[PDB]
Amino acid sequence: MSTDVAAAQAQSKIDLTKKKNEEINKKSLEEDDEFEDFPIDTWANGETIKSNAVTQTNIWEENWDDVEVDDDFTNELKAELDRYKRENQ
Amino acid sequence: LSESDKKSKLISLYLLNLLSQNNTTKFHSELQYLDKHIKNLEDDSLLSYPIKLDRWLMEGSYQKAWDLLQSGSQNISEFDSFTDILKSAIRDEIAKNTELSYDFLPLSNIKALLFFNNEKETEKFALERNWPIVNSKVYFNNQSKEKADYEDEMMHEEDQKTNIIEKAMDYAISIEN
Amino acid sequence: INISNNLQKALTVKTNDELMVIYISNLVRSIIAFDDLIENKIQNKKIQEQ
Amino acid sequence: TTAAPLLALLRENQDSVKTYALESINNVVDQLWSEISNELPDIEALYDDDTFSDREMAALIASKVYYNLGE
Amino acid sequence: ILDKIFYGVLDQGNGWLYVYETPNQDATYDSALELVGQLNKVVDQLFEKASVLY
Amino acid sequence: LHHSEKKYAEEDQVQELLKVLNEISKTTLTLDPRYIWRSLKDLSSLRNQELLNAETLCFTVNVLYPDSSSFKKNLLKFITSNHKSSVPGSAELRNSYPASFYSVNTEKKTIEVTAEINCFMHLLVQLFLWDSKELEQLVEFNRKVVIPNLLCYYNLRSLNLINAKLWFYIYLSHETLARSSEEINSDNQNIILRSTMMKFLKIASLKHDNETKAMLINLILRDFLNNGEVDSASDFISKLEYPHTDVSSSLEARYFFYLSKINAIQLDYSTANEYIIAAIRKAPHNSKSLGFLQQSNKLHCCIQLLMGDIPELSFFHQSNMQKSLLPYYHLTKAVKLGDLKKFTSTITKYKQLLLKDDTYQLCVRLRSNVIKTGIRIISLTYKKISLRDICLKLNLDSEQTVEYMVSRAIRDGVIEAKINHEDGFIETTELLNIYDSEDPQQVFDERIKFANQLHDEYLVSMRYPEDKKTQQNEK
Amino acid sequence: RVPNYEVSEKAFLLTQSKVSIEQRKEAAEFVLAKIKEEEMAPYYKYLCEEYLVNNGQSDLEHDEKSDSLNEWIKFDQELYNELCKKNESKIKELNEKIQKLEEDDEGELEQAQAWINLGEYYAQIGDKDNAEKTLGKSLSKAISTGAKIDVMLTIARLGFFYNDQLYVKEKLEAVNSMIEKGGDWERRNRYKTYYGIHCLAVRNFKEAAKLLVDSLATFTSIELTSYESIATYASVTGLFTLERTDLKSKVIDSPELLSLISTTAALQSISSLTISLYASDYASYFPYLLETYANVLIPCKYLNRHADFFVREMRRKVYAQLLESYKTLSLKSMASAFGVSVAFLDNDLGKFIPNKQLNCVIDRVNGIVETNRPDNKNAQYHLLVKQGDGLLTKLQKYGAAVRLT
């Protein structure tokens, strides 16, 4: 896979025969790739990887959302309420 | 015989001892060592006292710490030998804070904040902590001045400050080397 | 000081490109080097014959 | 393991455990070299005194440690 | 003020109008943004050269 | 048949060996033997894993064995015996050399140069244990034989650098055996292991063998992170003299990783942050490095939260590591919002996953930083804000309580505010116009010097392989 | 070709249930009508694939949901039987005729043209997979450059029909390569509008804004949604991207918008917002905000993803221009301007301020709002130094990688 911006770290490095074994060692040092433990641990498949539009699939650009609260409900309650108070003043 | 009833008791007291130096450096380093032994085997249930105390000062609630400590004088054995040091430590901690927070405080308000009930004790601490309370108003700013000056006063000092002229000299030599 | 910063950094761009260029020159010269060794085998024997 | 016992023993002012401790510190010296380098001036304190006949042992810890420190 | 045709800022904390007629934008600093801009573009392109070495 | 497959493999090994042996016979070199050795190491491991078990046995038999044959044989009988490929003329040969270990010469005993051969038979076996992937007794036998042998004689520059790659396997097999089982006698064997590591470094210190020196330091650091002896390790790191100019980039990444973990636990998160980003850049993007990257990137997210810096939303999305970094993601959203209520949920839900990465010890410290971030929100939104208002939003307990939270937080200068007791509000003091001040000057000075240093790296590297090519016969 | 974008557009209304009940129901009647006529039965079933047990589903073809307000989506097996009849029939007949044109020999012209005629049928019935193949054979055989532009576009329109934005994405890179090689202007206009609508669907509205102004001045209508819709897309992008001055000059120097006045509800709500925004009336700014939400974003395929993103960003801009003109405001004065109560305002400001793209602070006790946004030398400094860290970082890593290798 990738880390950081995908093209900036993808062009930077490749396998040579000299380095190849040595990477294998750093993974084993950690013990596991750590992406085959995570599915076991949830006991099926995730539930909160679908929590947000960017979280779901990385195909859209950022929208900086994390709350997911529609704002149209709260704005209608605001509009109508200021108006009645003023009217009956 | 390596993890014992006795171990759990002696680790608790040790942690208070590191804490009464008011070093967070050793405390968390020691805390890490414990994860691997007792902290989840026999659990925290007596080891909870320095760990809750550590918590309440990291967030900065001194009320919580004070309360925990007050009930920790219910625990009469040897935990109380550290209680009296550690109440003193909350004050000293608070007194660095107040320099930044306030520049005028009343005499009643300095007392309240440091958890005292005796005005004579407030003014006594002030001598020792090097505050000039003159006319019942503290002058935190006087104190800052002296503290800054001393760190300049010991030599290091041309390059500590840095000069407008000196920057250009450094850059110049690098290019022509 | 800020103009000087951009300029020092501009000169660093220029040099990291000159760093990559000579490094390509070396990658190229590698092929020539390999070829030369097999070739020098043939030459040694001839010069001793004469 | 740790050198932390050995520090405790020099810090104790009963002579027998100090003699002992010179011997034990030099056993584990090239393992616990960083830890005991911090509290090596203690070890030197015992060497300067004229109540000890285990001066040579005490010197000997430092020589092995000091190499490993890099001087 | 949105036209910028006399600049200034309007303060309703007391009812004044401050009329600032001072010069805007340093020309020298501003052209430094396009020069950095170009250096930030070029380095992606230098990195295209360095794909040769890899 | 089966024999034919071991012979075709063997002849590859012999050229690489023959080629190193001459360079070191002339005068010792470091890097040129090194480049050859690194290629060979990979190939040997791939050939032994996929093919046979007695392909290692063949070579050991063929050359003089000091005890290696008997040691190989013990292993092979347990996992299904072998007695084939013991034939003569594959054991009366000592391979082909021009005369350096040629079949007639070695029998004649004008020379005997088992040195390097000893070193290659140890690499074969050491890889084979790790290829088998069996623990228990097999690990123990591997440690016993090879270590005292290498230490009876004084090693040459060439042999010492070989022995660094042997040492790795020793630590790794032993460490997994210890993490699989709890046996009380193993603790006592760990003390012996610690002793051996540090002695290897001291021997190598004398010979100036730069790769050996770096490789050992990483292991010792690992060993501290596993045992909880963070306490010792503070000592260790201030007395290192680690090489950077003459070592492999895999070591240099590992080294940078360890430091951030140790520094972070001592409540220095400033230096922690710089060290992890450097380890990531050294370490590639491949799935070969995959478990390394996952752990490194966990620690980086947590670091930025410990600062109050907070990682962006960009990061988690553009990585394809979303499921793995899920506990950190929820943390990052939680800390930001200043929700104590959410935060209590996040570290509880995910508890186990965090502790395995051993960032859990760090994470608990955020229940406080969650509060400090939250009151920072309040002072930005509202410049001057009543003591009462703050208590309402984050469920704080008194005016007096919040006074005190903010008193600790502004010593660290997070909030960057000051409390007026006499009016009853908390007032941020920032208004910029710091361009006027001498602060930017200080910043610009630092930027230039990071650049001057980059010129130095460029100069030393660029011209040095040119100088070699000219000396070389190529034009 | 042409009926296809109408169907897709109507269907979208059934996908949601946040639209009005009476608007969804008229739209549903329409769709059934063209299901019969144009054979849109496969796309009817497709909407059910995109829910799985989500609102808008009530289908008798498969599972059904009783929490849906949709109830006009309910399939029949009359719908299904009518389909197999029509599909089977049409295809056998039309292919047969096309086959004889291939037989009659002329390679460049006759065969290539015969291959196009399949792709219209498969587009019509809304199968992407079969359309692509048959129209691929056409491109392979030498034909005029305009034709090639037409056909690549035709494929890219099937990606908006199903709403798979990526499908549009890939294919239009091929238009941008062939646009200059062809070098034709007829179809240049079309391109600017397609790639425009692509940008509209994603979060890149800057690119859209520059492409869509051109769309107004000159318009080609083939395979592009109705022109009243194209005005509505232009006004969205202009308000979101551009600031007071540019925005203002743009909608006075576009005769096309002004001659058309209002003509549908969506156009009206967008245009209203516009006037209020540069004219500095904030009383009526706020009703128009609510109105745009209902009638512009939700009905559009390409802005329903942005429904919430749109309101968020728009409150920032309005506030920015206000803050520009004032040194200080009182919260109560600032609330009366909008037509919202005192408490109502404080929430809204406080979601924007820690993110720090409003660049003001609120003295609560003084009740004033202060504005400490720099526009001096200090502002330039903030921009520059942040970019210069980024140059260092880029050189650092790429540096290190080349020295080691």
Q: Which residue has the tokens 């996040």?
A: F346
Q: Is C21 on the interface with E (CB under 8 A)?
A: yes
Which residue, among G276, B7, B35, B98, has the nearest Cα to F406 in the 3D structure?
A: B98
Tell me the nearest-neighbour CA distance from F377 into chain G, angstroms: 6
Q: Which two tokens stand for residue F374?
A: 């939250």
**Other CB atoms closer than 10 Å to residue E40's CB: what's the count?**
15
Chain C residues interacting with chain G (CB cutoff of 8 angstroms): 2, 5-6, 9, 12-13, 16, 19-20, 23
Q: Using CB atoms, which residue from A62, A68, A78 is nearest to G344? A: A78
- Cβ atoms of residues B7 and B19 within 8 Å: no
d(CA G141, CA F252): 57
Cβ separation of A59 and G166 shorter than 8 Å?
Answer: yes
Instruction: Give me the total of CB pairs closer than 8 Å, taking one residue from chain F and one from chain G.
Output: 68
Contact C17 E49 (CB under 8 A): yes
For residue A8, being part of any structural domain is answered with no
Q: How far apart are CA G321 and CA G87, in angstroms?
A: 58
Residue with tokens 């080891």: B47
DSSP string, E1-54: --S-SS--EEETTTTEEE--------HHHHHHHHHHHHHHHHHHHHHHHTTTT-
Alpha-carbon distance F109 to F18, whole Å?
19
Interface test mutation site (partner A, options G18, G308, G336, max chain A beta carbons within 10 A): G308
CA F215 – CA E13 distance, rounded (Å): 68
Nearest chain E residue (CA) to G329: E12
- 3-state SS assignment for residue B137: strand
Name the minimum distance, in Å, from the CA of G193 to any CA of chain C.
39
Q: Looking at chain C, which subunits does it touch, using at least 3 CB pairs closer than 8 Å as the criterion?
A: B, E, F, G
The minimal CB distance from E46 to the residues C9, C10, C16 is found for: C16
Q: Does C32 touch chain E (CB under 8 A)?
A: no
Tokens 């006499």 sit at which residue? F422
Dist CA D40 CA B31 (whole Å): 26
| CB-nearest partner of C12 from F451, F465, F466 | F451
Q: Check if C1 contacts B (Cβ < 8 Å).
A: yes
Contact (CB, 8 A) for G361 and F382: yes
Query: Which burial class, exposed, middle or buried, applies to F62 when counting CB atoms under 10 A from its CB (0-12, 13-18, 19+)?
Result: buried
Mutate to test the interface with E, among A5, A11, A13 (most CBs of E within 10 A): A11
Q: To which H or E segment does residue C27 belong?
A: helix C2-49
Query: A50 lies in a domain?
Result: yes
Cα-flanking dihedrals φ and ψ of residue F83, to 5°?
Answer: -145, -5
Instruction: Give the list of residues 6+ apart from residue G33 with CB closer than 8 angstroms, or none.
Output: none
Is residue A42 situated within a structural domain? Answer: yes
* Partners of residue B106 on adjacent β-strands: B137
Q: Are G341 and A78 spatial neighbours (Cβ–Cβ below 8 Å)? A: yes
Q: Do C22 and F466 touch (CB under 8 A)?
A: yes
CA–CA gap between residue F314 and residue F134 (Å, rounded) = 42
Residue bearing tokens 């090596």: D40
Cβ atoms within 10 A of the Cβ of G303, count? Answer: 20
- Retrieve residue G106's tokens: 């002329």
Instruction: Name beta bridge partners: G362.
Output: G369
Q: Concatenated DSSP letters for F256-302? A: HHHHHHHHHHTT--HHHHHHHHHHHHHS-SSSSSHHHHHHHHHHHHH
Enumerate the β-bridge partners of residue E10. Answer: E17, G326
CA angle G47, G130, G111 (to 5 degrees): 150
Amino acid at F140: E
Q: Give how far C48 is from chain F: nearest CA, Å.
A: 19
Residues 6+ apart with CB under 8 A from G367: G330, G331, G332
Please give, one letter per residue, the 3-state secondary structure of B22-78: CCHHHHHHHHHHHHHCCCCCCCCCCCHHHHHHHHHHHHCCHHHHHHHHHHHHCCCCC
Q: Are G231 and G254 in contact (CB under 8 A)?
A: no
Q: Do D38 and F235 touch (CB under 8 A)?
A: yes
Asked if F418's CB is within 8 angstroms of B102's CB, the reply is: yes
Cβ–Cβ below 8 Å for C2 and G384: yes
Instruction: Give the one of F266, F404, F449 whose C-beta lies nearest to B25's C-beta.
Output: F266
Task: In chain B, count H helices and then E strands.
Answer: 10, 2
β partners of residue F428: F417
Residues of C in contact with E52 (CB under 8 A): 20, 24, 27
Q: Alpha carbon D55 to chain centroid distance?
A: 11
Q: Length of chain A in residues, anyone? A: 89
**Phi-psi region for residue B100, left (φ > 0), alpha (ψ -120 to 50) or beta?**
alpha
Pair G283, G318: CB distance under 8 Å: no
Burial class for G376, CB neighbours closer than 10 Å (0-12, 13-18, 19+): middle
Give the whole-angstrom CA distance, residue B93 versus residue G299. Answer: 61
DSSP state of B132: -
Q: Is A15 a domain residue?
A: no
Question: Using what technique was this structure determined?
Answer: cryo-EM
C43 touches chain F (CB under 8 A): no
Question: Do G398 and A63 lie within an 8 Å CB cutoff?
Answer: no
G325–E contact, CB cutoff 8 A: yes
CB contact under 8 A, G365 and F386: yes
Please name the chains neighbouring B, where neighbouring means 3+ C-beta pairs under 8 angstroms. C, F
Smallest CA–CA separation between C39 and chain G, in Å?
Answer: 28
Distance CA C13, CA G394 (A): 10
Query: Into how many domains does chain A fold?
Result: 1
How close is the nearest chain G Cα to the Cα of E36, in Å?
7
**Alpha-carbon gap, residue F105 to F97, rounded angstroms:** 10
Q: Does the residue A4 lie in any domain?
A: no
CB contact under 8 A, A72 and G309: no
Dihedral of CA F83/F87/F92/F96: which sign?
A: negative
For chain F, list residues whose CB is within 8 angstroms of any CB belonging to chain B.
Answer: 227-231, 234, 265-267, 358, 361, 365, 367-368, 371-372, 397-398, 400-401, 404-411, 418-422, 442, 445, 448-449, 452, 455
| E47 touches A at CB < 8 Å | yes
Residues of A with CB below 8 A from G294's CB?
A: 72
Partner C contacted by G378 (CB < 8 A)? no
Gaps in chain E (C–N > 2.5 Å) come after which residues? none
Compute the C-alpha angle G87/G91/G96, nearest 5°. Answer: 160
Chain-chain contact of G395 with C12 (C-beta, under 8 angstroms): yes
Rounded Cα distance, F406 and F389, in Å? 14
List the single residue in F with minimal CA-CA distance to C38.
F474
Q: Best residue in C4, C19, C21, C30 to probe G by mutation, most G CBs within 10 Å? A: C19
G372 touches chain F (CB under 8 A): yes
Rounded (5°) CA angle F75-F79-F80: 110
- CA pseudo-torsion sign G204, G206, G210, G212: positive
* Chain A: closest CA distance from residue F41 (Å): 8
Q: Give a three-class secondary structure readout of chain G.
A: CCCHHHHHHHHHHHHCCCCCHHHHHHHHHHHHHHHHHCCCHHHHHHHHHCCCCCCCCCCCCCCCCCCCCCCCCCCCHHHHHHHHHHHHHHHHHHHHHHHHHHHCCCHHHHHHHHHHHHHHHHHHCCCHHHHHHHHHHHHHCCCCHHHHHHHHHHHHHHHHHHCCHHHHHHHHHHHHHHHHHHCCCCCHHHHHHHHHHHHHHCCCHHHHHHHHHHHHHCCCCCCCCCHHHHHHHHHHHHHHHCCHHHHHHHCCCCHHHHCCCCCCHHHHHHHHHHHHHHHCCCCCHHHHHHHHHHHHHCCCCCCCCCHHHHHHHHHHHHHHHHHHHEEEEEHHHHHHHHCCCHHHHHHHHHHHCCCCCCCEEEECCCCEEEECCCCCHHHHHHHHHHHHHHHHHHHHHHHHHHHHC
The resolution in angstroms reads 4.9
CA G100 to chain centre: 42
Chain F residues near residue A26 by CB distance under 8 angstroms:
250, 253-254, 283, 289, 291-292
Cα angle value G249/G251/G257 (rounded, 5°): 155
Chain mean position to CA G274: 19
**A31 lies in which domain range?**
23-89
Strand blocks (E) in F135-201: none
Identify whether the C-beta of residue B82 lies closer than 8 Å to the C-beta of residue B72. Answer: no
Output DSSP code: residue F65: -
| Tokens matching residue F197 | 């590591």
Instruction: Please check whether residue A69 lies inside any domain of the structure.
Output: yes
The Cα–Cα gap between F296 and F284 comes to 12
Q: Is residue A1 part of a domain?
A: no
Q: Does E14 touch chain A (CB under 8 A)?
A: no
Cα separation, G396 vs G389, in Å, equals: 11
Of F265, F372, F397, the CB nearest to B29: F265
Q: Which residues pair with G368 in a beta bridge?
A: G330
Nearest by Cα to G353 from G337, G340, G375, G369: G369
Report d(CA B79, CA F346) in Å as an integer.
Answer: 33
Q: Are F272 and F237 in contact (CB under 8 A)?
A: no
Task: Enumerate neighbours of A (3 or more CB pairs within 8 A).
Answer: E, F, G
> Does residue A16 fall inside a structural domain?
no
Structural contact between residues F306 and F300, judged by C-beta atoms closer than 8 angstroms: no
